[PDB]
Swiss-Prot record, chains A, B:
This is Cocaine esterase. It comes from Rhodococcus sp. (strain MB1 Bresler). Homodimer. The protein aggregates upon heat inactivation. Changing H286A: Loss of activity. Optimum pH is 9.0. InterPro entries: AB_hydrolase_fold (IPR029058), CocE/Ser_esterase (IPR005674), Galactose-bd-like_sf (IPR008979), Xaa-Pro-like_dom (IPR000383), Xaa-Pro_dipept_C (IPR013736), Xaa-Pro_dipeptidyl-ppase/CocE (IPR050585). One of its GO terms (cellular component) is cytoplasm. Its main location: cytoplasm.
Length: 573, 573
């Protein structure tokens, strides 16, 4: 019977080493074999409601004749073995796909879908080159775990992401108990304590002393905290460089305020020439898909459109798993939620055709410190050689507000920046009030001429839409840790007082700055706990005591010989 | 096989009039018949992800040997017939339960669970007295539709709830299309426009002119707007008076900021003496179960505990549908999230034993207008005969901020009230800063001595926790429409200038006001769009043009002869 299905729980699938992973099978009532969709989940395959609302109404896939297989990753819940993030997922996916392909009910066509870790695991599956894998649909994911979510292109530790997620995994383990241990109850509450105060947990020095998290999940220190360089431990789990050689269609979803946005978008660029790649990007953060934020509402059209996503995924899989050549007729290649106008828009490519990568130069009379300073932005090179200076003190970092925060207040991406506007270490540069709309849609970066009293420090840049009613809404941001200014692999220190030209990768956005608004850029040297604080010493940051850290006198240089600027991807249509 | 199940879609169940409702059957792999759980859904039975995250991980019920039946209510999605809210649900549930009982796979024991309309439909099922119905679990629901969600105990129209929900239903209809109509696309966008600006749609006068909503769903005007009195049209769909005669166990869930809280709690009180009733109340609003709000965080323990709820429901159904007499061992009768201390607490009853219903009297030197006026609250009767006066103008009502809002900004219950503190029509009365904690847990009401220049007006009261850092956090509130001061059924007007003692039902809360905080009460004459605005005319409010409405000079009397006060349910433990 069309539309009917059955569910078999805890089918045990042997891996190459004989460890058995548990799966649930959702199989249509069908005469013969069917196309199959695989989901690889570290958050309990039984708990479908917790992730699916961020993905698709996938029971529709089953009612329409696909089988769906949901798997507990190694070492968690009903699965055997030992859990360590990322390291086993290439091999376990390969072995799982091989098993699926062998079954009576599989017709030789497999796809995958899912969000976050359920998205990352799809890139790890894709690189095995198993012929039966015909398509993936990674949502809010990354193919390079150093670049997202654990560090970033600027080489700073994403400390709130790490502690937040580790506490979540830890709480899952205390749930996914052999048998309840005496310490379980207390551990559970203490993990809650981290989740209730992520900046507080990230504030302890040395950062690398984690007696609760490092005990429950040694990987937190052993892999992440201990490897600040993008070294071979990172490069062993990175898929990115293998993506260029694949020919696997990918339906890629991202969010403008999602921790993974930079890396999600980069995977689209990496696969689009070799296979049918699709891109959808909404104004969401990782835990807030609603379109509603404390000080910014995008409208009900911005709410994660779960049914439309379901229809699109089905069209995508119908094309690639069922040979329906016309299934994606009229489906755009790229679909973006353009903020400001707050509308969904179809595009033919990402980056957009006719992107004008336009410098807006940092300028102004007198100090740019605070929102009431003299800092300006202009498409004209600044006429005189100035410099703005501030003191960056690790004991008082600029607090994170919105952006791509994951666990520490990660539900307010377009946050109003006014609470940090009166701070002396936040340099502000804004345009005149606009009389014509300016659409900025694309990747964003800054080039700054900088100097420090210290042998290492950070520089941050944050793009902001200043509204007429006073709201100063965060759009995108990034950081450069100075030791990593040229390379994330082979860092070197800087000379005090020497001027450097550095690049700041500020990820991507889509916003129309409307008449009446200003384009604003904040420059500082911290953004905590989104990123861990630079000690200003050149030492091993995570091993340092706060008391041992230094303040730094940091300087932004601007003028005709040091044309510091933000590069904005300008669209005129 | 234990843990395995099958799903049959669109099984068509004949009602007494021969109209067929569609159901999906989730049935365990079982030798013989099983206990059955029924869910009656107006939001598409296929779309399980949209409501279930507000309820239970109910697939666990199926893996553990219960069948689950999810039904499309009459006239929606796969069901035949014509949709009108509430009126068919008693009979359709009765007929559906009878059909379930007849099936090979039903062992004679039926229960129900679900949230909101999926909760209301359970009270409508319960009153049929079908013997096989052994238990219900209504979450965030009501047994009296006039009292929640459409009007309230104060006799004012809950206008944002009505327009918001009607627009949602309307959008569902445009989805649940015979075949797409030419006007569908535009209607859809215009319904979005209501949802994006609920106060704006509620602002149009006459309110009863609704060319889009009244066309899509005539009931909006025909039933709701047209019947402001709690008349026989309302009393035909009310279950409340029949609840006292039932002996059906009910697992009742509510939220402190949920539109249905007053009525959810009242159903517990109505059934607790005749059957095993259970109560769980968290700090949630109808669309925000996260425990996170713009200016108030309750901690991760406050996040709707979906797995714990699942375990409790299973224990409850194991007791009542499977005869497991010891299944609820160690399960509290009442479990409340106590705000302020922000902790879950077990109780033996609701109302709590040893509740001291304590008057806090309105007092102070000089005018109580604004937060910086002289208004005070005290357990001592005020010594001199004063009065506070303001002008209530319908064209400028006090905006709704937090509370039990449903669709207009209904995701911020504990809203900071500071944005309306400088208004002249908001009278404020606060205690001294507390040196000892004060726990207020129970139903809350006010008694005010009032007078008006008008022959009808409203009075509002709102309980507020003022934090040391300035936050003034809304807790509970209510309204009295003066014509309904004595009765919701037979209203009469008031004489201008004459003093009346009125009761304001402020629903319920659980909060510890901690040392350093103040207890604060706001008094006004509007709370829009939570409630529609009184025209101050004595006319038919929903039929009046704004231009035809009057301002009113309203007066709150306080002192030894007019001891206006709030009654707080004080707990000392
Ligand atoms: C997703 O499930 O949430 C996490 C945010 S850090 C991430 C881990 S790769 O995947
Ligand atoms: C629930 O499903 O949401 C509505 C809020 S007004 C309500 C209608 S009775 O049920
Ligand atoms: Cl089988
Ligand atoms: Cl293992
Ligand atoms: Cl262990
Ligand atoms: Cl907005
Ligand atoms: Cl749109
Ligand atoms: Cl100098
Ligand atoms: Cl130089
Ligand atoms: Cl059958
Ligand atoms: Cl009908
Ligand atoms: Cl019609
Ligand atoms: Cl708080
Ligand atoms: Cl608690
Ligand atoms: Cl007078
Ligand atoms: Cl009198």
């Amino acid at each position: 019977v069309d539309g009917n299905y059955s569910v078999a729980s805890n089918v045990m699938v042997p891996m190459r080493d004989g460890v058995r992973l548990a799966v649930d099978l959702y199989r249509p009532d069908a005469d013969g074999p069917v196309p199959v969709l695989l989901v690889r989940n570290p958050y309990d395959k039984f708990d479908v409601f917790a992730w699916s609302t961020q993905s698709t109404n996938w029971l529709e896939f089953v009612r329409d004749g696909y089988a769906v297989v949901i798997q507990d990753t190694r070492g968690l819940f009903a699965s055997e073995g030992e859990f360590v993030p990322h390291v086993d997922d290439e091999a376990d996916a390969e072995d799982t796909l091989s098993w699926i392909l062998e079954q009576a009910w599989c017709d030789g066509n497999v796809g995958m879908f899912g969000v976050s870790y359920l998205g990352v695991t799809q890139w790890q599956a894709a690189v095995s080159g198993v012929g039966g894998l015909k398509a993936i649909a990674p949502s809010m994911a990354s193919a390079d775990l150093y670049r997202a979510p654990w560090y970033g292109p600027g080489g700073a530790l994403s400390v709130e992401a790490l502690l937040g997620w580790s506490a979540l995994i830890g709480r899952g383990l205390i749930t996914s108990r052999s048998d309840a241990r005496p310490e379980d109850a207390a551990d559970f509450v203490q993990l809650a304590a981290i989740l209730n105060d992520v900046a507080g947990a990230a504030s302890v020095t040395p950062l690398a002393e984690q007696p609760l998290l490092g005990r429950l999940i040694p990987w937190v220190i052993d892999q992440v905290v201990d490897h600040p360089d993008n070294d071979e431990s990172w490069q062993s789990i990175s898929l990115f460089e293998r993506l260029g050689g694949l020919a696997t269609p990918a339906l890629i979803t991202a969010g403008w305020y999602d921790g993974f946005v930079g890396e999600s978008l980069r995977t689209f660029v990496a696969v689009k020439d070799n296979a049918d790649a699709r891109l959808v990007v909404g104004p969401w953060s990782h835990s807030n898909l609603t379109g509603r934020n404390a000080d910014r509402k995008f409208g009900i059209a911005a709410t994660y459109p779960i049914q439309e996503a379901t229809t699109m995924h089905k069209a995508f899989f119908d094309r690639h798993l069922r040979g329906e050549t016309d299934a994606l007729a009229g489906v755009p290649k790229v679909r973006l939620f353009v903020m400001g106008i707050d509308e969904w828009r179809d595009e033919t490519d990402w980056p957009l055709p006719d992107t004008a990568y336009t410098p807006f130069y940092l300028g102004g009379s007198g100090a740019a410190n605070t929102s009431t300073g003299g800092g300006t932005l202009s498409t004209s090179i600044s006429g005189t050689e100035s410099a703005d200076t501030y003191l960056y003190d690790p004991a008082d970092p600029v607090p994170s507000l919105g952006g791509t925060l994951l666990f520490h207040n990660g539900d307010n991406g377009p946050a109003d920046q006014r609470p940090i506007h009166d701070r002396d270490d936040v340099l502000c540069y804004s345009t005149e009030v606009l009389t014509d709309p300016v659409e900025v849609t694309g990747t964003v970066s800054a080039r700054l001429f900088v100097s420090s009293s210290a042998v290492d420090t950070d520089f941050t840049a944050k793009l902001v839409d200043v509204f007429p009613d006073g709201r100063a809404i965060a759009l995108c941001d990034g950081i450069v840790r100075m030791r990593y200014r040229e390379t994330l692999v082979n860092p070197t220190l800087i000379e005090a007082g020497e001027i450097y030209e550095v690049a700041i990768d500020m990820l991507a956005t889509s916003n129309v700055f409307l008449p009446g608004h200003r384009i604003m850029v904040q420059v500082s040297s911290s953004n905590f706990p989104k990123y861990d604080r630079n000690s200003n010493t050149g030492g091993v940051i995570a091993r340092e005591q706060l008391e041992e850290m230094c303040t730094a006198v940091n300087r932004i240089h601007r003028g005709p010989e040091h044309p510091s600027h933000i590069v904005l991807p300008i669209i005129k249509r």
